[PDB]
Design a binder for this molecule. Structure first.
Ligand SMILES: CC1(C)SCCN[C@H]1C(=O)NCc1cccc(C(=O)N[C@H](C(=O)Nc2ccccc2)C2CCCCC2)c1
Lengths: 100, 101
């Protein structure tokens, strides 16, 4: 497992819209100073069931979050403002309605 | 503005088949790009225009839309460089949800 060190220039140079969803969700920020990005919003489902056409909640269905695996930069060594090792974390990118 | 170069150790220590019971199911599509890390990117593609109800049929009174999110990749700068990158912001479909038109 030889380390593949790489230079990266951090200078980039380039849920409320899905509120009509049957399985709506909110955004919860995740702060971690020893990580890039430091702030990660995570999708928290608003209901246990799914909202039907009428408007009320149907609990025969389940509003589950969509958990995906992405990469984040972990400070190696700790508290290093210029040295990172990328790590594989699990986050919720949204919600979807599923059947039992 | 002023460039912000940092050191990144690239040595680390079916996502659509999981949510097949979704009312707004989707598949994964390959997006290949040599000058980008990671190279392969799987984007979610909704399998139906409408959503699936309790009867298993497709209700077109509802719409299954792709959940688009802004993520980061690593663009090669200079081009074809195997050790130097500048991260860019790209837009991908991380899944599908069922909405009401
Ligand atoms: C795209 C999907 C997950 S969607 C579901 C189906 N296909 C997946 C897929 O194909 N994954 C592979 C892939 C493709 C492209 C990029 C990433 C990636 O891990 N980008 C990182 C990132 O941006 N993380 C982040 C942290 C907190 C807030 C927002 C974003 C950055 C990487 C470079 C260093 C810095 C971090 C991964």
């Amino acid at each position: 497992n030889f380390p593949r060190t790489v230079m990266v220039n951090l200078n980039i140079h380039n849920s409320d819209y899905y509120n009509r969803s049957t399985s709506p969700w909110n955004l919860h920020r995740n702060e971690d100073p020893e990580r890039y990005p430091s702030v990660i919003w995570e999708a928290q489902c608003r209901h246990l069931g799914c909202i039907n056409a009428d408007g009320n909640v149907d609990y025969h269905m389940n509003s589950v979050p969509i958990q995906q695996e992405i990469l984040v930069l972990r400070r190696e060594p700790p508290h290093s403002p210029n040295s990172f090792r990328l790590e594989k974390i699990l986050v919720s990118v949204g919600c979807t309605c599923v059947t039992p």
